[PDB]
Amino acid sequence: DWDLVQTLGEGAYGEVQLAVNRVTEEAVAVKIVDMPENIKKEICILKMLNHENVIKFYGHRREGNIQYLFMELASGGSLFDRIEPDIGMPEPDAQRFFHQLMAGVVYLHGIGITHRDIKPHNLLLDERDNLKIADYSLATVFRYNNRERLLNKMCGTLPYVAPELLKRREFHAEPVDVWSCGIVLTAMLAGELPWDQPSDSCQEYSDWKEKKTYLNPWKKIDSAPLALLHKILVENPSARITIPDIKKDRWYNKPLKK
Ligand SMILES: C[C@@]1(N2CCN(c3cc4cc(NC(=O)[C@H]5CC56CCOCC6)ncc4cc3Cl)CC2)COC[C@@H]1O
């Protein structure tokens, strides 16, 4: 029925491949996973999703120990491939992608879902350059019956993880996703990641906490988006800006063209 044409990327459990229909020539993205409690969780979350800034999930087929997850093929590819190394991208394009990222994250948080691994590799683009949050393999429920549950599991990607995840036994889900969006914004505006990890043993992170914004990547960033990044990349998650307040930010609301 299908045929694995090209590899689109690889995760912890399974691989994502470009599948072209043997009859219709319809090209889709298929996540092929071998072997359980996590794929049942992932399928459950994928069926809950319905938003313009979240990848479309078609369905799932099981073949013994093999699990197939059918998803929307994003023709524009990844946000990662739009970032020019050491440069980034034009500020109006970065603003628009950030507005769309916030829209997708507000939606997820609104249904009580935390993504837990936001990065340019899983932010995909459709034919009209609309951003779509993909890869729900680490996603979990942080709110149910209007009651918040604290996270305790270590997961994500070190340059994108919030510092409380490395320090605290339990932490709130929403500030962790806000933090990763901040690193994505830095990547879009500088074409460079600021640190290997947000720990005191990492010089670049110590430099940021000491406000050495005359250093890269910060010196490449204009004063307005840099003021926003100062509010996002705050060590104490209880003092960190929330998405309702990000929506009131000067740069977030700055009219930009071309
Ligand atoms: C594990 C990681 N990844 C794996 C790939 N993955 C997906 C990749 C997809 C990729 C695409 N579309 C394309 O690649 C566009 C460019 C073309 C043009 C058309 O032809 C085909 C290639 N569409 C849908 C996808 C759906 C998903 Cl879910 C996201 C998660 C995250 O961290 C490291 C890895 O990158």
Side-chain angles (χ1 to χ4, degrees), residues 6-20 27-31 42 46 55-56 69 71-78 80-81 115 117 119-125 133-137 157:
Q6 195 211 280
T7 302
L8 302 171
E10 296 184 284
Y13 285 91
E15 182 182 69
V16 180
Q17 280 234 19
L18 167 63
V20 168
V28 298
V30 181
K31 198 200 180 188
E42 194 184 354
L46 285 166
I55 55 95
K56 211 79 197 167
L69 300 174
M71 296 153 193
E72 177 200 339
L73 183 76
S75 71
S78 73
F80 180 88
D81 289 332
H115 184 278
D117 199 24
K119 50 178 170 182
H121 285 291
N122 46 41
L123 302 172
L124 304 159
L125 310 167
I133 309 177
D135 194 14
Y136 292 82
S137 57
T157 304

Short mmCIF file of all heavy atoms in Angstrom, two decimals, residues 6-20 27-31 42 46 55-56 69 71-78 80-81 115 117 119-125 133-137 157, ligand 1:
data_model
loop_
_atom_site.label_atom_id
_atom_site.label_comp_id
_atom_site.label_asym_id
_atom_site.label_seq_id
_atom_site.Cartn_x
_atom_site.Cartn_y
_atom_site.Cartn_z
N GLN A 6 12.06 7.96 1.50
CA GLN A 6 13.16 8.70 2.11
C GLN A 6 12.96 8.84 3.62
O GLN A 6 11.82 8.92 4.08
CB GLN A 6 13.24 10.11 1.47
CG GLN A 6 14.54 10.87 1.72
CD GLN A 6 14.30 12.36 1.78
OE1 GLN A 6 14.18 13.04 0.75
NE2 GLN A 6 14.23 12.91 2.99
N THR A 7 14.06 8.90 4.39
CA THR A 7 13.99 9.12 5.83
C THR A 7 13.87 10.64 6.07
O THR A 7 14.64 11.42 5.50
CB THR A 7 15.19 8.48 6.54
OG1 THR A 7 15.20 7.08 6.25
CG2 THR A 7 15.16 8.70 8.06
N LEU A 8 12.89 11.03 6.90
CA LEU A 8 12.61 12.42 7.27
C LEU A 8 13.27 12.79 8.61
O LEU A 8 13.47 13.97 8.90
CB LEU A 8 11.09 12.68 7.33
CG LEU A 8 10.27 12.40 6.06
CD1 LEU A 8 8.78 12.47 6.35
CD2 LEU A 8 10.64 13.34 4.94
N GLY A 9 13.61 11.77 9.40
CA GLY A 9 14.23 11.94 10.71
C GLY A 9 14.02 10.76 11.65
O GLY A 9 13.11 9.95 11.44
N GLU A 10 14.85 10.69 12.70
CA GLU A 10 14.82 9.60 13.69
C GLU A 10 14.71 10.11 15.12
O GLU A 10 15.44 11.03 15.51
CB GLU A 10 16.09 8.72 13.57
CG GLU A 10 16.24 7.98 12.25
CD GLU A 10 17.44 7.06 12.19
OE1 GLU A 10 18.58 7.56 12.03
OE2 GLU A 10 17.25 5.82 12.29
N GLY A 11 13.84 9.46 15.90
CA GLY A 11 13.62 9.75 17.32
C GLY A 11 14.08 8.62 18.23
O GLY A 11 14.72 7.67 17.76
N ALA A 12 13.74 8.72 19.54
CA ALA A 12 14.10 7.73 20.56
C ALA A 12 13.50 6.37 20.23
O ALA A 12 14.23 5.38 20.10
CB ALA A 12 13.64 8.19 21.94
N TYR A 13 12.17 6.33 20.05
CA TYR A 13 11.45 5.12 19.68
C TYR A 13 10.95 5.32 18.25
O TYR A 13 10.13 6.20 17.99
CB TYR A 13 10.28 4.84 20.65
CG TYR A 13 10.73 4.31 21.99
CD1 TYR A 13 11.01 5.16 23.05
CD2 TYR A 13 10.85 2.94 22.21
CE1 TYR A 13 11.42 4.68 24.29
CE2 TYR A 13 11.26 2.44 23.45
CZ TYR A 13 11.54 3.31 24.49
OH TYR A 13 11.94 2.82 25.71
N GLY A 14 11.54 4.55 17.32
CA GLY A 14 11.19 4.56 15.91
C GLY A 14 11.88 5.58 15.01
O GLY A 14 12.80 6.29 15.43
N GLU A 15 11.39 5.64 13.76
CA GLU A 15 11.88 6.49 12.68
C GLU A 15 10.68 7.07 11.91
O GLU A 15 9.64 6.40 11.78
CB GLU A 15 12.76 5.65 11.73
CG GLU A 15 13.39 6.39 10.57
CD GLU A 15 14.22 5.52 9.65
OE1 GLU A 15 13.63 4.68 8.93
OE2 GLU A 15 15.46 5.68 9.63
N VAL A 16 10.81 8.32 11.43
CA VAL A 16 9.81 9.01 10.61
C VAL A 16 10.27 8.93 9.15
O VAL A 16 11.40 9.33 8.83
CB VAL A 16 9.53 10.47 11.07
CG1 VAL A 16 8.48 11.14 10.18
CG2 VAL A 16 9.11 10.53 12.53
N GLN A 17 9.42 8.40 8.27
CA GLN A 17 9.76 8.25 6.86
C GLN A 17 8.72 8.81 5.91
O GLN A 17 7.54 8.87 6.25
CB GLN A 17 10.06 6.78 6.51
CG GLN A 17 11.47 6.33 6.92
CD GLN A 17 12.27 5.73 5.79
OE1 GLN A 17 11.98 5.90 4.60
NE2 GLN A 17 13.32 5.00 6.15
N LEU A 18 9.17 9.23 4.72
CA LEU A 18 8.30 9.72 3.66
C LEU A 18 7.70 8.49 2.97
O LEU A 18 8.44 7.66 2.43
CB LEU A 18 9.09 10.61 2.65
CG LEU A 18 8.40 10.94 1.31
CD1 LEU A 18 7.13 11.75 1.51
CD2 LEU A 18 9.34 11.67 0.37
N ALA A 19 6.36 8.36 3.02
CA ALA A 19 5.65 7.24 2.41
C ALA A 19 4.75 7.72 1.27
O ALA A 19 3.87 8.57 1.49
CB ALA A 19 4.84 6.49 3.45
N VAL A 20 4.99 7.20 0.06
CA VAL A 20 4.22 7.53 -1.14
C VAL A 20 3.29 6.35 -1.44
O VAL A 20 3.77 5.23 -1.59
CB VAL A 20 5.19 7.85 -2.33
CG1 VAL A 20 4.45 7.92 -3.66
CG2 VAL A 20 5.95 9.15 -2.07
N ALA A 27 1.78 11.41 -0.93
CA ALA A 27 2.97 11.40 -0.08
C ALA A 27 2.61 11.88 1.33
O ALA A 27 1.98 12.92 1.50
CB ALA A 27 4.06 12.26 -0.69
N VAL A 28 2.95 11.06 2.35
CA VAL A 28 2.68 11.33 3.76
C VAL A 28 3.91 11.05 4.63
O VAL A 28 4.90 10.48 4.15
CB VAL A 28 1.41 10.60 4.31
CG1 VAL A 28 0.13 11.02 3.58
CG2 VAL A 28 1.58 9.08 4.29
N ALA A 29 3.85 11.44 5.92
CA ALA A 29 4.90 11.17 6.89
C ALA A 29 4.41 10.02 7.77
O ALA A 29 3.30 10.07 8.31
CB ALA A 29 5.17 12.41 7.74
N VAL A 30 5.22 8.96 7.86
CA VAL A 30 4.84 7.80 8.68
C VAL A 30 5.89 7.52 9.75
O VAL A 30 7.07 7.42 9.43
CB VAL A 30 4.49 6.53 7.83
CG1 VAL A 30 4.06 5.36 8.73
CG2 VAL A 30 3.39 6.82 6.81
N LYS A 31 5.45 7.42 11.01
CA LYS A 31 6.33 7.10 12.13
C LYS A 31 6.21 5.59 12.36
O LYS A 31 5.14 5.11 12.72
CB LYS A 31 5.93 7.89 13.40
CG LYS A 31 7.04 7.93 14.44
CD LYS A 31 6.53 8.27 15.83
CE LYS A 31 7.67 8.28 16.82
NZ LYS A 31 7.18 8.41 18.22
N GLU A 42 0.97 8.19 23.32
CA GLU A 42 1.22 9.02 22.13
C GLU A 42 0.02 9.04 21.17
O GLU A 42 -0.36 10.12 20.70
CB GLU A 42 2.50 8.58 21.42
CG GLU A 42 3.02 9.59 20.40
CD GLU A 42 4.23 9.19 19.58
OE1 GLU A 42 4.82 8.12 19.86
OE2 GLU A 42 4.61 9.95 18.67
N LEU A 46 -2.33 12.25 20.16
CA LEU A 46 -2.45 12.57 18.74
C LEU A 46 -3.91 12.70 18.27
O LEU A 46 -4.19 13.53 17.40
CB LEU A 46 -1.66 11.60 17.85
CG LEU A 46 -0.13 11.76 17.81
CD1 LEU A 46 0.52 10.54 17.20
CD2 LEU A 46 0.30 13.02 17.04
N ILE A 55 0.53 19.59 13.82
CA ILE A 55 0.47 18.64 12.69
C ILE A 55 -0.82 17.82 12.71
O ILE A 55 -1.30 17.45 13.79
CB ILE A 55 1.70 17.70 12.50
CG1 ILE A 55 2.02 16.90 13.77
CG2 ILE A 55 2.91 18.45 11.96
CD1 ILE A 55 1.41 15.49 13.83
N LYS A 56 -1.34 17.52 11.52
CA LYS A 56 -2.56 16.73 11.41
C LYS A 56 -2.19 15.25 11.49
O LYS A 56 -1.21 14.80 10.87
CB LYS A 56 -3.30 17.06 10.10
CG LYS A 56 -4.82 16.91 10.20
CD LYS A 56 -5.49 18.11 10.89
CE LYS A 56 -6.89 17.79 11.37
NZ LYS A 56 -7.41 18.81 12.31
N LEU A 69 2.22 5.27 12.48
CA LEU A 69 1.52 6.51 12.82
C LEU A 69 1.53 7.43 11.60
O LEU A 69 2.60 7.84 11.14
CB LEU A 69 2.15 7.19 14.06
CG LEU A 69 2.14 6.40 15.37
CD1 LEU A 69 2.91 7.13 16.46
CD2 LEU A 69 0.73 6.11 15.84
N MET A 71 0.81 10.79 9.59
CA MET A 71 0.78 12.23 9.83
C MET A 71 0.88 13.04 8.55
O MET A 71 1.38 12.55 7.53
CB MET A 71 1.91 12.64 10.80
CG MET A 71 1.79 12.04 12.18
SD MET A 71 3.42 11.88 12.92
CE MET A 71 3.03 10.83 14.30
N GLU A 72 0.45 14.31 8.64
CA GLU A 72 0.48 15.31 7.59
C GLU A 72 1.91 15.53 7.12
O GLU A 72 2.81 15.68 7.94
CB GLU A 72 -0.10 16.63 8.15
CG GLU A 72 -0.08 17.82 7.21
CD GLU A 72 -0.20 19.17 7.89
OE1 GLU A 72 -0.68 19.23 9.05
OE2 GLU A 72 0.19 20.18 7.26
N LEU A 73 2.12 15.51 5.80
CA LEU A 73 3.43 15.79 5.24
C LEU A 73 3.49 17.31 5.04
O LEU A 73 2.65 17.87 4.34
CB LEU A 73 3.71 15.03 3.93
CG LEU A 73 5.12 15.24 3.33
CD1 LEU A 73 6.19 14.45 4.09
CD2 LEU A 73 5.15 14.88 1.86
N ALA A 74 4.44 17.96 5.71
CA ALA A 74 4.64 19.41 5.64
C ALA A 74 5.64 19.68 4.51
O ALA A 74 6.81 19.35 4.64
CB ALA A 74 5.17 19.92 6.97
N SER A 75 5.16 20.25 3.37
CA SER A 75 5.97 20.49 2.16
C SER A 75 7.12 21.47 2.35
O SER A 75 8.14 21.37 1.66
CB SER A 75 5.09 20.91 0.98
OG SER A 75 4.57 22.22 1.12
N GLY A 76 6.96 22.41 3.29
CA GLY A 76 7.98 23.41 3.59
C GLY A 76 9.14 22.89 4.41
O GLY A 76 10.13 23.60 4.60
N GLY A 77 9.04 21.65 4.90
CA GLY A 77 10.09 21.05 5.72
C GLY A 77 10.15 21.61 7.13
O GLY A 77 9.14 22.05 7.66
N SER A 78 11.33 21.61 7.74
CA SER A 78 11.49 22.06 9.12
C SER A 78 11.98 23.50 9.29
O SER A 78 12.66 24.03 8.41
CB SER A 78 12.41 21.11 9.89
OG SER A 78 13.76 21.27 9.51
N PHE A 80 14.24 24.21 11.37
CA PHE A 80 15.69 24.01 11.45
C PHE A 80 16.36 24.35 10.12
O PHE A 80 17.37 25.05 10.11
CB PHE A 80 16.02 22.56 11.85
CG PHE A 80 17.51 22.31 11.95
CD1 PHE A 80 18.19 22.55 13.14
CD2 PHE A 80 18.24 21.85 10.85
CE1 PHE A 80 19.57 22.33 13.23
CE2 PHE A 80 19.62 21.66 10.93
CZ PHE A 80 20.27 21.89 12.12
N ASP A 81 15.78 23.87 9.01
CA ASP A 81 16.34 24.09 7.67
C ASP A 81 16.12 25.51 7.11
O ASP A 81 16.70 25.84 6.08
CB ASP A 81 15.83 23.00 6.70
CG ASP A 81 16.45 21.63 6.98
OD1 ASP A 81 17.59 21.59 7.51
OD2 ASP A 81 15.81 20.62 6.68
N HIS A 115 4.27 19.70 25.48
CA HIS A 115 5.04 19.03 24.43
C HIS A 115 6.34 18.39 24.97
O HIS A 115 6.67 17.27 24.59
CB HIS A 115 5.35 20.01 23.29
CG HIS A 115 6.06 19.38 22.14
ND1 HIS A 115 7.44 19.17 22.15
CD2 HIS A 115 5.57 18.98 20.94
CE1 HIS A 115 7.72 18.64 20.97
NE2 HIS A 115 6.63 18.51 20.21
N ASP A 117 9.55 18.91 24.35
CA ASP A 117 10.75 18.84 23.50
C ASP A 117 10.67 19.78 22.30
O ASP A 117 11.10 19.43 21.20
CB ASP A 117 11.07 17.37 23.08
CG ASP A 117 12.50 17.13 22.60
OD1 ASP A 117 13.40 17.90 22.98
OD2 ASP A 117 12.72 16.15 21.85
N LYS A 119 11.74 22.27 19.68
CA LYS A 119 13.00 22.65 19.03
C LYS A 119 12.76 22.81 17.53
O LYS A 119 11.75 22.29 17.06
CB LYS A 119 14.12 21.62 19.33
CG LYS A 119 13.73 20.17 19.07
CD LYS A 119 14.93 19.26 19.36
CE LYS A 119 14.56 17.81 19.36
NZ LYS A 119 15.74 16.98 19.68
N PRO A 120 13.66 23.48 16.78
CA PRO A 120 13.42 23.70 15.33
C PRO A 120 13.23 22.44 14.49
O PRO A 120 12.55 22.53 13.46
CB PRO A 120 14.64 24.52 14.89
CG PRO A 120 15.03 25.26 16.12
CD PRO A 120 14.88 24.19 17.19
N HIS A 121 13.77 21.28 14.92
CA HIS A 121 13.60 20.01 14.21
C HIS A 121 12.15 19.51 14.19
O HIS A 121 11.80 18.79 13.27
CB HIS A 121 14.52 18.91 14.78
CG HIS A 121 15.95 19.06 14.38
ND1 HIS A 121 16.36 18.87 13.07
CD2 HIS A 121 17.03 19.35 15.14
CE1 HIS A 121 17.67 19.06 13.07
NE2 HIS A 121 18.12 19.36 14.29
N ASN A 122 11.31 19.85 15.21
CA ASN A 122 9.93 19.36 15.22
C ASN A 122 8.88 20.47 15.00
O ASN A 122 7.70 20.29 15.31
CB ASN A 122 9.61 18.52 16.45
CG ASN A 122 10.05 19.07 17.77
OD1 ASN A 122 9.94 20.26 18.05
ND2 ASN A 122 10.55 18.18 18.63
N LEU A 123 9.31 21.59 14.43
CA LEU A 123 8.42 22.70 14.05
C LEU A 123 8.50 22.70 12.53
O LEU A 123 9.55 22.96 11.95
CB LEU A 123 8.87 24.03 14.67
CG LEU A 123 8.96 24.07 16.22
CD1 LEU A 123 9.62 25.36 16.71
CD2 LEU A 123 7.59 23.83 16.88
N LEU A 124 7.42 22.24 11.90
CA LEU A 124 7.38 22.05 10.46
C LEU A 124 6.56 23.10 9.77
O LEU A 124 5.76 23.77 10.40
CB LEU A 124 6.89 20.63 10.12
CG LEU A 124 7.71 19.50 10.77
CD1 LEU A 124 6.92 18.26 10.82
CD2 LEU A 124 9.04 19.28 10.04
N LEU A 125 6.78 23.27 8.47
CA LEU A 125 6.11 24.29 7.67
C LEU A 125 5.29 23.71 6.54
O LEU A 125 5.76 22.83 5.81
CB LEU A 125 7.16 25.30 7.15
CG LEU A 125 8.13 25.87 8.21
CD1 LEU A 125 9.27 26.56 7.58
CD2 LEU A 125 7.42 26.78 9.20
N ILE A 133 3.44 22.35 15.11
CA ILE A 133 4.15 21.63 16.16
C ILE A 133 3.97 20.11 15.92
O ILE A 133 2.84 19.59 15.95
CB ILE A 133 3.71 22.07 17.59
CG1 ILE A 133 3.76 23.62 17.77
CG2 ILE A 133 4.55 21.35 18.68
CD1 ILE A 133 3.28 24.09 19.10
N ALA A 134 5.09 19.43 15.68
CA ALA A 134 5.13 17.97 15.47
C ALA A 134 5.87 17.23 16.60
O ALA A 134 6.45 17.87 17.48
CB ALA A 134 5.77 17.66 14.12
N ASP A 135 5.85 15.87 16.55
CA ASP A 135 6.56 14.95 17.47
C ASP A 135 6.03 15.02 18.91
O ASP A 135 6.56 15.76 19.75
CB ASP A 135 8.09 15.16 17.40
CG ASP A 135 8.91 14.06 18.04
OD1 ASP A 135 8.34 12.97 18.32
OD2 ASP A 135 10.12 14.27 18.25
N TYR A 136 5.02 14.18 19.20
CA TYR A 136 4.32 14.08 20.48
C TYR A 136 4.76 12.86 21.30
O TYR A 136 4.06 12.45 22.22
CB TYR A 136 2.79 14.12 20.27
CG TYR A 136 2.37 15.49 19.78
CD1 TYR A 136 2.47 15.83 18.43
CD2 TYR A 136 2.07 16.50 20.69
CE1 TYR A 136 2.22 17.13 17.99
CE2 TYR A 136 1.82 17.80 20.26
CZ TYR A 136 1.87 18.11 18.90
OH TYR A 136 1.63 19.38 18.47
N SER A 137 5.94 12.33 21.00
CA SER A 137 6.50 11.15 21.68
C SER A 137 6.85 11.40 23.14
O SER A 137 6.84 10.47 23.94
CB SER A 137 7.69 10.59 20.91
OG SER A 137 8.72 11.53 20.72
N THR A 157 15.88 18.10 25.17
CA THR A 157 17.15 18.26 24.47
C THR A 157 17.91 19.33 25.24
O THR A 157 17.41 20.45 25.35
CB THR A 157 16.86 18.59 22.98
OG1 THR A 157 16.04 17.55 22.43
CG2 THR A 157 18.13 18.75 22.15
C1 LIG B 1 12.93 13.20 15.99
C2 LIG B 1 13.07 14.48 15.16
N1 LIG B 1 11.95 14.63 14.08
C3 LIG B 1 11.86 13.56 13.02
C4 LIG B 1 11.03 14.04 11.84
N2 LIG B 1 9.68 14.44 12.28
C5 LIG B 1 8.68 14.62 11.29
C6 LIG B 1 9.23 15.06 10.11
C7 LIG B 1 8.40 15.44 9.03
C8 LIG B 1 8.92 16.04 7.85
C9 LIG B 1 8.01 16.53 6.90
N3 LIG B 1 8.38 17.09 5.66
C10 LIG B 1 9.60 17.19 5.09
O1 LIG B 1 10.63 16.68 5.54
C11 LIG B 1 9.60 18.01 3.81
C12 LIG B 1 10.92 18.52 3.27
C13 LIG B 1 10.16 17.53 2.45
C14 LIG B 1 9.47 18.02 1.17
C15 LIG B 1 8.51 16.95 0.68
O2 LIG B 1 9.15 15.68 0.52
C16 LIG B 1 9.64 15.21 1.78
C17 LIG B 1 10.74 16.11 2.33
N4 LIG B 1 6.68 16.46 7.05
C18 LIG B 1 6.20 15.87 8.13
C19 LIG B 1 6.99 15.33 9.17
C20 LIG B 1 6.47 14.82 10.39
C21 LIG B 1 7.30 14.49 11.42
CL1 LIG B 1 6.61 13.93 12.91
C22 LIG B 1 9.69 15.41 13.38
C23 LIG B 1 10.54 14.91 14.54
C24 LIG B 1 13.09 15.70 16.16
O3 LIG B 1 14.42 15.77 16.65
C25 LIG B 1 15.34 15.24 15.69
C26 LIG B 1 14.49 14.65 14.58
O4 LIG B 1 14.46 15.62 13.52
#
